[PDB]
Design a protein around this ligand. Structure first.
Ligand SMILES: [O-][O-]
Ligand SMILES: [Cu+2]
Ligand SMILES: [Cu+2]
Ligand SMILES: [Cu+2]
Ligand SMILES: [Cu+2]
Lengths: 533, 556
């Protein structure tokens, strides 16, 4: 049935603008309030059916994930993937993509009810399906002292109700598992420096060099290691007994509360000022890295192994991990929040205006004005409510500033300008330090003097185009001055590849700014010979 | 079928002379397929058997501990006047190796029988003879926890959630199936199983809230539903398995895994009697024993700490079934661990052949019934319980090991497998040896488990836990819950300390750690450091141990 018309869940008067809930709040409601976990059952059962549909079914989990990147085939009659990255339509392309997923799941819930619920209970189960929306993962909220992956994502199994008659079933949010290695799928669907061709299941930090290749078939879900990455902060805050602040929460707070940005500044890493370089896509890029892992190996000798790679860090395959959609649900929510407090800023600066009318292929919609099938466009989804969902935080804009502070609440900042194609398109991580760099340990918050990272979510650039990100630096500069006779630090950086080696030929523009004036220029730090690319 | 289950080992076949139990990594690698298929399919059936089936995985694991029910007509245990559960398994006694020798054989036999049933139900005429031949040649593989996989590791196959198997009748077809060696999973939380089988209680970990076995998966302050299946943190287990002194992670120093050094000592040290070798039950040179090394591996595989005081972003704690005597038999790796413990017993027997229940203390236990395991006595024509003498020669159970196939070659194979790294690094330093002796009461914390960590030099009052902890030397784990003894190598850590301390011999400092990560100040441990001239491949006490204090917030 093509074209598939994306609409959002249809309107029903008994269900006015239902909200997409925080997935932890929702999980707790469903399992705690009492035993009637009907929405949890519906989502589990429907997503399981979708994951088990065949590859020639374009509404299969695999084909839905395939729209984003590999294996780069057609979708819905529409012949680098469809996904928009490093352009101003990044938020709107993904807004439609998340709505497509939600709609397909709702439709499969209705099918589950027709299949498994007795007549006399159908109205009760239909009511719950019509009230459900895709929950979001609030990656910047403290879990019910630290940031965490959703409760439900960390559960291999989940208890469900059996209509008419609980029962434990594999949790389709934990992983996506195929019946064979993805590199051996039928043409044209096969997925063929990270061994994704040798995976049967999606994995978080599961792929490491120097283990039997059969381990890569399912490398597991190292959610504790992802939670550690998610709470990245400067190294000094782990010292006895300084308090820590997760950089991701600070970045999210600043993104939502800094005023003045135009749509082009907010929407994307694309650079075609530095104070306005904290953008939605850059934060989204670091979260992809922190959930999945991107380093397959590390040089040298190490007892504790903190590396390991996984689907969410890799553009061509990230959409196969079920948390992809929950991450993007919150990116949609952050967009809606920022729209609410920046209500005039929508593709109307000189750089982003050109992209406003881009067709958001491959997504189809019917137009009422021509009674014609057309592609989605950004203006079609400016009001997300037109798609019949909302967020609690935007339903009531009156004290939105208060909820933002309640949730995520001289200045110094780091600016970072880079090419996504500095390594021919391969991903890399830009790590910044204040002070001497350890030539064998230049990786993460456990690395001496580490301040923060910028992840290049990629896998030549458009001429004239680069990418930007921004890191908070106030707390780290204060510590460094204290330790270093009041010296303002020279930012040192290392560009790290998926083998954990430093790429010395890569030039990145790193600078320190203070309230903003430029006070120090970044320099590349050298590492040990053995750790050099 | 209303009759005692007679344990015999896999029945004898002339075309299959004393088949060997293989190293499970070598066995897997030379298949990465009928034997693999047979083991996966048979164990899957056994795991999915109902609780009323005495040959179900659950009831076979149940023999060892909780939920302390009957098996094969033999009444199950109860808490004593003491308030301690009483079950079948022997720990802290000299029959520890022989009770577990029979238990491992029971498991192997049940699997073989399930292999034959699988062939009768699934294999076509053409392949039945070849499949039956592989079942008859198969023996339970062992996990060589002390052999390098560079580093020690959990078996490849234990780290794989799925495994590909052959499909009889479909030449070349293979199917990916859940790996029964990865975990054991039940249909509901074990705390709510039908009576009398619920896992409940005291326990200090939420095992009543698990549906599946886990390695390092249980941590405080996560949603209780995460504990239903905490996952298999096999990388964390490998890290624990490679425990060594802290100083060896410093630049300019070479490392040796303590487990490999301990196992090499165990096998090469002469002059121990059976009572010394067989058990923790209690000169300190002879305190390096089989049960103590086995207790440490249980800890390292499973983890025992549920929490840690204060705030830590990197969380190195986490608990799981293998650390806990009442539920450890539910993890499929339990059987592979105990297969190697059987192999180490056989190797040691081979190079100490007159040392069988040969001392005054163990002699008194030689004749104990090894309940609940039945066999038929030919001399009396009665069904009786196994006794230790029945399994002195493991080959009477119709299995063998490659290393015990030739006595004349066994000392060289021991050095080639377990001694080359120790000798490589010890050879860089003077001709002396140092060892730590450790004596404690398994009852010291009301029966709860605990870990004894030893340090040379100052102890970090917020980090007294593992190889990443400043000045850590090694650990001793109280698995079992009369005293108990263990020994640690100390030669390399003493050398490091002397070089930092103008040649002073270190005072061993100890901390007793509970499951909450806190220091127990009233558990008694006797620790001492001993020296001899000459490498180990006449000890005298050179220092007395002392309890270390920790930060106020880290005190029990
Ligand atoms: O001993 O298990
Ligand atoms: Cu994308
Ligand atoms: Cu994304
Ligand atoms: Cu035991
Ligand atoms: Cu044991």
């Amino acid at each position: 049935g093509s074209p598939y018309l994306i609409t959002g869940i249809p309107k029903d008067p008994k269900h006015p603008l239902p909200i997409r809930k925080d997935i932890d709040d929702w999980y707790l409601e469903q399992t705690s309030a009492g035993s009637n976990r009907i929405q949890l059952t519906l989502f589990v059962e429907a997503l399981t059916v979708i994951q088990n549909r065949p590859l020639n079914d374009q509404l299969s989990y695999f084909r839905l994930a395939g729209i984003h990147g590999a294996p780069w085939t057609e979708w819905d009659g529409v012949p680098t993937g469809f996904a928009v990255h490093n352009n101003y339509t990044f938020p709107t392309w993904h807004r439609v993509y998340v709505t497509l997923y939600e709609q397909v799941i709702y439709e499969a819930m209705l099918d589950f009810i027709k299949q498994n619920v007795p007549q006399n209970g159908k109205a009760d189960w239909e009511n719950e399906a019509k009230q459900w929306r895709l929950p979001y993962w609030d990656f910047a909220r403290f879990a019910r002292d630290e940031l965490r992956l959703p409760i439900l994502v960390t559960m291999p199994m989940v208890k469900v109700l059996v209509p008419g008659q609980q029962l434990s079933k594999p949790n389709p949010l934990y992983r996506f598992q195929m019946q064979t290695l993805m590199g051996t799928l039928e043409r044209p669907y096969a997925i063929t420096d990270l061994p994704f061709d040798k995976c049967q299941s999606t994995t978080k930090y599961g792929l490491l060099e120097n283990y039997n290749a059969d381990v890569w078939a399912d490398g597991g879900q190292n959610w504790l290691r992802a939670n550690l990455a998610l709470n990245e902060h400067p190294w000094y805050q782990n010292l006895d007994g300084w308090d820590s602040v997760p950089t991701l929460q600070d970045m999210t707070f600043r993104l939502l509360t800094t005023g003045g940005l135009n749509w082009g500044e907010f929407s994307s890493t694309r650079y075609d000022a530095p104070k306005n370089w904290m953008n939605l896509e850059a934060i989204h890029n670091n979260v992809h890295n922190w959930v999945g892992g991107f380093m397959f190996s590390r040089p040298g000798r190490h007892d504790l192994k903190l590396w390991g790679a996984g689907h969410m860090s890799s553009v061509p395959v990230a959409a196969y991990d079920p948390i992809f959609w929950l991450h993007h649900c919150n990116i949609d929510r952050l967009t809606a929040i920022w729209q609410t407090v920046n209500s005039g800023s929508w593709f109307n600066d000189d750089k982003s205006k050109v992209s406003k009318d881009d067709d958001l292929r491959p997504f189809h919609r019917f137009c009422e004005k021509t009674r014609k099938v057309v592609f989605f466009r950004s203006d079609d989804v400016k009001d997300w409510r037109s798609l019949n969902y909302d967020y609690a935080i935007t339903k009531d804009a009156s004290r939105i500033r208060k909820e933002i502070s309640d949730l995520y609440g001289e200045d110094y900042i780091l600016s970072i300008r880079y090419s996504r194609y500095a390594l021919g398109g391969k991903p890399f991580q830009i790590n910044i330090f204040f002070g001497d760099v350890d030539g064998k340990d230049f990786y993460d918050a456990r690395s001496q003097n580490f301040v923060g990272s910028v992840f290049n979510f990629s896998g030549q650039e458009q001429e004239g185009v680069l990418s930007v990100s921004q890191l908070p630096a106030r707390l780290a500069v204060h510590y460094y001055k204290k330790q270093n006779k009041g010296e303002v630090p020279t930012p040192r950086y290392v560009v790290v590849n998926s083998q954990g080696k430093a790429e010395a030929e890569v030039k990145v523009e790193v600078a320190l700014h203070k309230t903003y004036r430029r006070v120090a220029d970044g320099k590349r730090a050298e590492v040990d010979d053995a750790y050099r690319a």
